[PDB]
Amino acid sequence: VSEKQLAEVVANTITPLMKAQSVPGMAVAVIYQGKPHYYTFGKADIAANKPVTPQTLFELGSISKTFTGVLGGDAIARGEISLDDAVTRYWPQLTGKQWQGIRMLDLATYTAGGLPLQVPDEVTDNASLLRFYQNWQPQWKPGTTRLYANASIGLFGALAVKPSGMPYEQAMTTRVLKPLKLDHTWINVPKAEEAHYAWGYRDGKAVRVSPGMLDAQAYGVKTNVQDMANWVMANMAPENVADASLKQGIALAQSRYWRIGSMYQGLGWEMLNWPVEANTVVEGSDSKVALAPLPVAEVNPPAPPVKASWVHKTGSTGGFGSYVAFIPEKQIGIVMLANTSYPNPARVEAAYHILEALQ
Ligand SMILES: *[B@@]1([O])O[C]([C]C([O])=O)[C]=[C][C][C]1[N]C(=O)[C]C1=[C][C]=[C]S1
Numbered sequence: 001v002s003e004k005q006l007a008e009v010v011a012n013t014i015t016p017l018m019k020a021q022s023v024p025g026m027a028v029a030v031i032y033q034g035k036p037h038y039y040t041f042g043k044a045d046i047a048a049n050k051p052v053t054p055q056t057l058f059e060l061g062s063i064s065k066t067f068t069g070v071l072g073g074d075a076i077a078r079g080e081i082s083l084d085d086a087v088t089r090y091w092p093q094l095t096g097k098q099w100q101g102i103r104m105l106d107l108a109t110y111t112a113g114g115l116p117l118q119v120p121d122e123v124t125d126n127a128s129l130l131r132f133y134q135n136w137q138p139q140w141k142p143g144t145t146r147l148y149a150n151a152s153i154g155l156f157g158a159l160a161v162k163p164s165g166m167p168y169e170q171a172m173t174t175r176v177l178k179p180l181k182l183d184h185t186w187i188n189v190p191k192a193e194e195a196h197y198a199w200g201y202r203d204g205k206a207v208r209v210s211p212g213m214l215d216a217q218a219y220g221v222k223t224n225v226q227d228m229a230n231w232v233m234a235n236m237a238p239e240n241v242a243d244a245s246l247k248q249g250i251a252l253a254q255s256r257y258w259r260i261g262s263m264y265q266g267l268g269w270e271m272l273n274w275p276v277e278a279n280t281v282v283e284g285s286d287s288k289v290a291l292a293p294l295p296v297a298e299v300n301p302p303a304p305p306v307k308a309s310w311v312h313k314t315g316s317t318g319g320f321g322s323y324v325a326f327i328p329e330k331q332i333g334i335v336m337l338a339n340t341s342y343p344n345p346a347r348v349e350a351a352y353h354i355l356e357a358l359q
């Protein structure tokens with residue numbers, strides 16, 4: 001499949017998508033034959049008439065969780081934490097007896113027993129954060145029910161960096177971003193970079209993400225399409241990652257911990273076995289499945305990375321919608337960054353269609 005044909009397949013999928021979903025701007029990377037290929041469409045900022053470029057910063061939303069998963073894996077590989085350890089090992093002040101039996105694994109993979117999708121808006125400091133988790137009453141025993149949640153993996157990422165003594169942003173930069181040369185990926189956008197920051201859009205209004213507790217760990221990363229392509233490349237082919245603990249952390253994040261229907265839960269990353277049909281992946285992305293509390297089948301010991309996987313993550317904020325998927329066996333992958341949050345099934349369908357052209 002030539003560069004020219006690939007550019008046509010991308011244009012012919014994305015242009016109708018943007019029209020149908022009222023998306024002002026998109027940046028796309030396709031990973032193919034050892035390198036990224038970049039396609040940019042529309043506007044980063046409508047009022048200012050600024051085009052999307054390969055340097056335009058997008059809000060990743062929950063694709064931030066893949067960075068959380070890999071940083072946590074790296075901590076495991078340094079010997080600083082174990083997924084088998086009790087959450088209370090890293091938070092001794094968390095004295096409530098309901099936390100017994102809840103492992104760092106459970107926090108990382110949404111199986112703690114019903115931690116909710118969000119940290120409540122009244123949580124504004126450490127005292128309030130502690131109170132929230134102290135007062136939480138699990139609806140299910142640990143290791144029985146997956147409920148996708150910021151309050152779960154968010155807390156995992158905060159606790160994962162504690163033994164290192166490093167704050168979370170610092171740990172992420174030193175241990176994940178810098179070694180991979182992701183030098184335009186930000187939890188907090190510096191002043192000097194602000195001109196690259198797209199506006200998000202919802203129902204015609206410009207919007208950007210506001211602060212919340214555990215945001216950095218759950219939904220706070222911003223990045224451009226070059227850094228995201230290289231992030232996808234590193235996760236798709238970790239054999240080329242030099243730092244030993246980081247390479248193992250990447251493997252840990254794509255390891256299978258639980259089966260839930262047709263999908264498997266990694267650390268941030270989710271996986272289906274390849275080959276998989278589009279309707280299987282599309283159906284799973286629907287909110288009525290994706291947000292539901294669902295029974296789990298344990299994968300113990302965790303299964304190491306399966307090369308024949310569809311590996312993916314969707315993420316949104318108020319004004320952005322992003323999606324990434326890759327197939328390590330085929331060495332193909334895609335990044336779709338957009339400045340409006342459009343339906344996840346639509347992201348999956350487009351990503352699957354483009355990657356199908358490469359098979
Ligand atoms: B995150 O982006 O993940 C999505 C995944 C999906 O769409 O199935 C859903 C919920 C949690 C995450 N999103 C949010 O927390 C919403 C926002 C965060 C900041 C502003 S809105």
Ligand SMILES: [Cl-]
Pocket residue numbers: 089090162163
């Ligand atoms: Cl600690």
